[PDB]
């Protein structure tokens, strides 16, 4: 972990980006969050 936690944030922040490509704010505001919380979990 960590080396992966740092890798999963990116995985999240990507999905989030991919989500805004359909204006899906819901998913976005969530993944961009599950990600941030985790960067604090670091």
């Amino acid at each position: 972990d960590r080396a992966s936690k740092i890798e999963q944030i990116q995985k999240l922040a990507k999905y989030a980006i991919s989500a805004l490509n359909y204006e899906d704010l819901p998913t976005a505001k969530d993944e961009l969050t599950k990600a941030l919380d985790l960067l604090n979990s670091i």
């Binding site: 991919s18 490509n21 359909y22 204006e23």
Partner: protein, 308 residues
């Protein structure tokens, strides 16, 4: 006997799955953009596999690589490789990589490599052992110049692909089902110069309606849509004047100025084609089922989840 073309397809022509896009921009455009970085220990990729469900645009993306390649882009299906006799089935492979090295720097595409693999068991014995053996040894071997040419593999069945050829295709990429925005883009591309009727969020309504298609599915619903108002004109009785001197369009039986006639009855030009609008689109969506299956997607998530 051997085909070649410098096609039209661009990266902006391709819509969707940008990780494979930047991967091929690296492994193909990066020898073009910076050949001087690749020296000694740093070597370009020799074997790249694309795979997944059918109709996802792997050959089309290979044509994008072809246009931005500036190289002798070969491409072959299995049909130029199946054994009719007992030995042009193999010497043509030898001449394929031979003339591929003759036109170096070059790119080779093979579509549906699953027809050449599967050494486990003894089914499809002589063709699989001889032709597949020559694909292995001739792909790299004793004195093959593995530099230069690039081997692009496509398939729909990657688990029946043998592990040795799986190692030969050293950089493999899964191509999933695309998303909402890319199919909106392919709708707005494939409508082309035809005068449409909808807006961008209406194409978003279309892509929301069409969850889980392929690129060919989009190509044929757009194709059927380019039959739809023409199908209105070829149908039924009764037209009507509207509005540069006389102009008539199809209307229901009994309407404001509804004469009874056929398209044949009506004068050159002075036809008013029905607008192109969605009810025809949604009717075409209700016309055709998605072809692909989801348990096959579970196996693609199995092999992708492991080896991807």
């Amino acid at each position: 006997a051997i085909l070649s073309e410098k096609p039209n397809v661009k990266w902006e022509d391709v819509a969707g799955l940008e990780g494979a896009k930047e991967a091929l921009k690296e492994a193909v455009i990066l020898p073009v953009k910076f050949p001087h970085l690749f020296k000694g220990n740093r070597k370009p990729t020799s074997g790249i596999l694309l795979y997944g469900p059918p109709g996802t645009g792997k050959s089309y993306l290979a044509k994008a690589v072809a246009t931005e390649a500036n190289s002798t882009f070969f491409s072959v299906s299995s049909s130029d490789l199946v054994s009719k006799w007992m030995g042009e089935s193999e010497k043509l492979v030898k001449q394929l990589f031979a003339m591929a090295r003759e036109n170096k720097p070059s790119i080779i595409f093979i579509d549906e490599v699953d027809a050449l693999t599967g050494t486990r068991g003894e089914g499809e014995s002589e063709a699989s052992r001889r032709i597949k053996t020559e694909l292995l040894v001739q792909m790299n071997g004793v004195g093959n110049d593995s530099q230069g040419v690039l081997v692009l593999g496509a398939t729909n069945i990657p688990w029946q692909l043998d592990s040795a050829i799986r190692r030969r295709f050293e950089r493999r990429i899964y191509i999933p089902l695309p998303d909402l925005a890319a199919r909106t883009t392919m709708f707005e591309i494939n409508v082309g110069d035809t005068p449409c009727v909808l807006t961008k969020e209406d194409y978003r309504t279309l892509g929301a309606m069409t969850e889980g298609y392929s690129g060919s599915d989009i190509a044929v619903v757009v194709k059927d849509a380019l039959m739809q108002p023409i199908r209105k004109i070829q149908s039924a009785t009764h037209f009507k004047d509207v509005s540069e001197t006389r102009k008539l369009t199809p209307c229901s039986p009994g309407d404001d100025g509804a004469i009874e006639m056929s398209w044949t009855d009506i004068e050159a030009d002075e036809l008013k084609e029905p607008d192109l609008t969605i009810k025809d689109f949604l009717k075409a969506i209700k016309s055709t089922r998605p072809t692909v299956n989801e348990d096959d997607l579970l196996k693609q998530e199995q092999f992708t989840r492991d080896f991807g």
